[PDB]
């Protein structure tokens, strides 16, 4: 049975105006800015952008990859697909 999201979890994350996007739940570094209440820091593969999202916009990667894990024209998407499949827990700084 599902637990709550934790850092390291792999997801497709949904933002308005963008397709469901390969992403992970990030850690917050010591001394780094904390997310709002009820939000997680999402790192987006490919773009390497960070946004703060709640669970309504987070789809677990394994369940969802057959639906959302196809190439897309958008900038950074295909790079993002390689990262989440090939090295999802790497430093992308």
- Is residue 5 a part of any domain in this protein? no
DSSP structure class, residue 6: -
Q: How was this structure determined?
A: X-ray
Range of 18's domain? Answer: 10-30+37-82
- Is residue 4 a part of any domain in this protein? no
Q: Which of 37, 41, 32 is nearest to 9 (CA)?
A: 41
- Lookup result for tokens 């990262």: 83
| CATH, residue 21 | 2.30.30.140
Contact residues for 27 (Cβ-Cβ < 8 A; gap 6+): 7, 8, 41
- Is residue 91 a part of any domain in this protein? no
The CA distance from 9 to 61, in Å, is 8
- Is residue 19 a part of any domain in this protein? yes
Q: Which of 70, 93, 92, 73 is nearest to 83 (CA)?
A: 92
- Is residue 93 a part of any domain in this protein? no
Which residues are paired to 58 by β-bridges?
A: 13
In this structure, what token pair is assigned to residue 69? 């894990």
The CA distance from 77 to 22, in Å, is 8
Q: How many structural domains compose the chain? A: 1
Pairing relationship of beta strands 58-60 and 10-13 according to DSSP bridges: antiparallel
């Amino acid at each position: 049975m599902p637990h709550a999201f934790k850092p390291g979890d792999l997801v497709f994350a949904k933002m308005k105006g963008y397709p469901h996007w390969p992403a992970r739940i990030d850690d917050i570094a010591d001394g780094a800015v904390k997310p709002p209440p009820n939000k997680y820091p999402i790192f987006f593969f490919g773009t390497h952008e960070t946004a703060f999202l709640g669970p309504k916009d987070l789809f677990p990667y394994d369940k969802s990859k057959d639906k959302y894990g196809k190439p897309n024209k958008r900038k950074g998407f295909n790079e993002g697909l390689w990262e989440i499949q090939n090295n999802p827990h790497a430093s992308y700084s």
